[PDB]
């Protein structure tokens, strides 16, 4: 017989025995995150190598197949996951050095130590405290000192470590037949199959900024408004020609502007939409919130969840020594096992988080029918975008009034609409330029375009044009400032976050059009509209079995990624900012600095 039948039989033998091991490993992980105990720890080891002792061995049985002639797209794509060289192509010394440098970089980043000079006996970490201090404060000196100290104890000594990590990852990139690690990172948004849908990895690079130029004027108006509010609060710290520094953004990275929302509130006279006091008055516990959110999911069009989830899955208050880390997670343990992990409480934020996690669960339901190697979405951003869709949709007053969360006689006006829209934009569009520049900097440092010396100064000068940040203190060559970030020390692709917002906005806009809703986009709700849920689930069921370009064809009519929904959402905000900061001129200068 032909080799294709042999490959099919190999896959049919592989998936059946892989399902049991994957289920056992995921069950152990879920139990440990639900039962923090010593015994569940070694099990991971007892599973980990074991899983490798299976998977790599199956990978060992996935090279002799000439994976270039299998006509069936699904079988060839499934076998392609098993036909990955990985780090095994590297030498043993190189692999162990990579493991050691990754471990030490992660430990150093996660063990930040900043002691104030007056009391050198007490440092602070990324744990609550200094994080909270810089997240919520009104000052220029303490924030700047904290930023400088963190960049000194995480970026000063990480220059050789980051250099070696980048060069060794890139050596592995060539070892995996890739001239750059950026190609391997962008391979998630890649397909070379069906005609009319094939996407090149290098095309995503230009698509990132081709969808970014349209939000540049709106970002400039938002920057001008924030600068004006800073001048209102901070006296003579930011010149009108210049721009605000990094430490005044509410974080040492300036990732999100939500921390600075209090200073730049549009209208504090009208309170925000919050029914948590009504949630307590209505006596909505974790069970009631979960049931109401599941009912909303069903009314949208997503199927009711299978039995057994309500018992195994932890919901609230681990309590005693039977502890459980409850970071919001949705577990797809395999073999039809879907569970939630969260400290669900009586809170609107917890309400939205529960909606997000059960949206993740519903998407896990969507591609459950796919084989083990295809038990994933078209791209990693689709999962997060889908999880965020209904969480964003449920915040509208219509859904709250449908189940009587807001008052039955609640009336909205333009003031609170503008306030909410600006608050949402301070987190949604206020992070796109930073993610864009960070991803481009990672791409160019992996490509080796910039020499060894020209790393930090180029980053700081380009942040002025892209983000709009000046340097309160200098960092030329003795600092590695982006290295003090979560997704720098664990080899994390950062394009997923950039694509997730655009994907979720496109899906929300498409559902708003095909959901019989009228008015502003921010008030759009998809509750009790089964057609929108069916349209969503049609694309959800695709999973990894279909390309991402083909996946972006059911909900939306355009395969390519576009920016129009982003500007459509913040239309009232754009109109308000057109006439709000008229006196303050738009734009910033990259020559002005706090020091000179």
């Amino acid at each position: 017989s032909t080799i294709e039948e042999q490959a099919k039989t190999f896959l049919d033998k592989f998936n059946h025995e892989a399902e049991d091991l994957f289920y056992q490993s995921s069950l152990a992980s879920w139990n440990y995150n639900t039962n923090i105990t010593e015994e569940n720890v070694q099990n991971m080891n007892n599973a980990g190598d074991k899983w490798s002792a299976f998977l790599k061995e199956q990978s060992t049985l996935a090279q002799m197949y000439p994976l270039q002639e299998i006509q069936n797209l699904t079988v060839k794509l499934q076998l392609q996951a098993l036909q990955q060289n990985g780090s095994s192509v590297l030498s043993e010394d190189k692999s162990k050095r990579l493991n050691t440098i990754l471990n030490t970089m992660s430990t150093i980043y996660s063990t930040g130590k900043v002691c104030n000079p007056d009391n050198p006996q007490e440092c602070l970490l990324l744990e609550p405290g200094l994080n909270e201090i810089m997240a919520n404060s009104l000052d220029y000196n303490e924030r700047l000192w904290a930023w400088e100290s963190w960049r000194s104890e995480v970026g000063k000594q990480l220059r050789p470590l980051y250099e070696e990590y980048v060069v060794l990852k890139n050596e592995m990139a060539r070892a995996n037949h890739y001239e750059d690690y950026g190609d391997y990172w962008r391979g998630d948004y890649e397909v070379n199959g069906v005609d009319g849908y094939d996407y090149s990895r290098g095309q995503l690079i230009e698509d990132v900024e081709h969808t970014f130029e349209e939000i540049k004027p709106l970002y400039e108006h938002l920057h001008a408004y924030v600068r004006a509010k800073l001048m209102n609060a901070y006296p003579s710290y930011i010149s009108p020609i210049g721009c605000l520094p990094a430490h005044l953004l509410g974080d040492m990275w300036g990732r999100f502007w939500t921390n600075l929302y209090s200073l730049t509130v549009p209208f504090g006279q009208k309170p925000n939409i919050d029914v948590t006091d009504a949630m307590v008055d209505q006596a909505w516990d974790a069970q009631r919130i979960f049931k109401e959110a599941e009912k909303f999911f069903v009314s949208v069009g997503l199927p009711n969840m299978t039995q057994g989830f309500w018992e195994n899955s932890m919901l609230t208050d681990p309590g005693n020594v039977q502890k459980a880390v409850c970071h919001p997670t949705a577990w797809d343990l395999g073999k039809g096992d879907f569970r939630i992990l969260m400290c669900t409480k009586v809170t609107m934020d917890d309400f939205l988080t529960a909606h997000h996690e059960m949206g993740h669960i519903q998407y896990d339901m969507a591609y459950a029918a796919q084989p083990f190697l295809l038990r994933n979405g078209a791209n990693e951003g689709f999962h997060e975008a889908v999880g965020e869709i209904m969480s964003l949709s449920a915040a509208t007053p219509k859904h709250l009034k449908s189940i009587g969360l807001l008052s039955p006689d609640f009336q909205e006006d333009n003031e609170t609409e503008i306030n909410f829209l600006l608050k949402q934009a301070l987190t949604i569009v206020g992070t796109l330029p930073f993610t864009y520049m960070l991803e481009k900097w990672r791409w160019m440092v992996f490509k080796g375009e910039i020499p060894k010396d020209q790393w930090m100064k180029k980053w700081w000068e380009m942040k002025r044009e892209i983000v709009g940040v000046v340097e309160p203190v200098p960092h030329d060559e003795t600092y590695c400032d982006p290295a003090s970030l979560f997704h720098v020390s664990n080899d994390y692709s950062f394009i997923r976050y950039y694509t997730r917002t655009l994907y979720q906005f496109q899906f929300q806009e498409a559902l708003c059009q095909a959901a019989k809703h009228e008015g502003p986009l921010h008030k759009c709700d998809i509750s009790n509209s089964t057609e929108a849920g069916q349209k969503l689930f049609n694309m959800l069921r695709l999973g990894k079995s279909e390309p991402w370009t083909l996946a972006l064809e059911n909900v939306v009519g355009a395969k390519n990624m576009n920016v129009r929904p982003l500007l459509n959402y913040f239309e009232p905000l754009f109109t308000w900012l057109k006439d709000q900061n008229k006196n303050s001129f738009v734009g910033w200068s990259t020559d002005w600095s706090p020091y000179a």
Partner: protein, 247 residues
């Protein structure tokens, strides 16, 4: 026993109550193909064959006439002309084990599809490429039989389902199994009709003093006209008189 070693049972020379099987909530799926389940108690065949085994939850649909699949082709086969019923029910509470009930095994590789009412228990290694598998498993060598990792928490799709397929054969041999009879009570001194042990007729039934020998069932006087019958339950001699008529 496992699906590839399905238990075969032969039932003959007895009376079958299909109503109680129909009136049982313990069976999740009950699909008949010969006749309606209620009518099954009326008609009958000469023998019954039961094929009982345990499978996955998702493989119950495979056990059907004109159906294809791993179980439907490699472990058991049902012909298009199948007469009878199929009764399946979840057994996760019993068959599934906390440590894994790996005893249950199902066939995954075989050169030919199994014939109807045929069993395969071959454990010989299967070859899918060109190189023969000379004993020890190599490149193109995968075991035809795969075990079941049944656990109490496996989702409805994978739960162990017990399936019994009942077929009815009515060969030229005399029938041996039939349904119930549900005889009524007895009345006297009234013009009624009757079907005593399959002997039908009208008239009035009175008490008689005739002495049947211990083996007759009914007696007629002359010209082939039945007069006395023996009730199959009480075993006593009755008397039949035609209902009165005249001008």
């Amino acid at each position: 026993a496992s699906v590839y070693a399905w238990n075969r049972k032969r039932i003959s020379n007895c009376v079958a109550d299909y109503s109680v099987l129909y009136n049982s909530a313990s069976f999740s799926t009950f699909k008949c193909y010969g006749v309606s389940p209620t009518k099954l108690n009326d008609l009958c065949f000469t023998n019954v064959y039961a094929d009982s085994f345990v499978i996955r939850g998702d493989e119950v649909r495979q056990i059907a006439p004109g159906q294809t699949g791993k179980i439907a082709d490699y472990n058991y086969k049902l012909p298009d002309d199948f007469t009878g019923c199929v009764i399946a029910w979840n057994s996760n509470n019993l068959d599934s084990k906390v440590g894994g009930n790996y005893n249950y095994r199902y066939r995954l590789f075989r050169k030919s599809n199994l014939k109807p009412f045929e069993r395969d228990i071959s454990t010989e290694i299967y070859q899918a490429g060109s190189k023969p598998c000379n004993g020890v498993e190599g490149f193109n060598c995968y075991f035809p039989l795969q075990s079941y990792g049944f656990q109490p928490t496996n989702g409805v799709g994978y739960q162990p389902y017990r399936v019994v397929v009942l077929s009815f054969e009515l060969l030229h041999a005399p029938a041996t199994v039939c349904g119930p009879k549900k005889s009524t009570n007895l009345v006297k001194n009234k013009c009624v009709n009757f079907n005593f042990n399959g002997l039908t007729g009208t008239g009035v039934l009175t008490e008689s003093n005739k002495k049947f020998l211990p083996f007759q069932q009914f007696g007629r006087d002359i010209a082939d006209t039945t007069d006395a019958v023996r009730d199959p339950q009480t075993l006593e001699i009755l008397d039949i008189t035609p209902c009165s008529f005249g001008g």
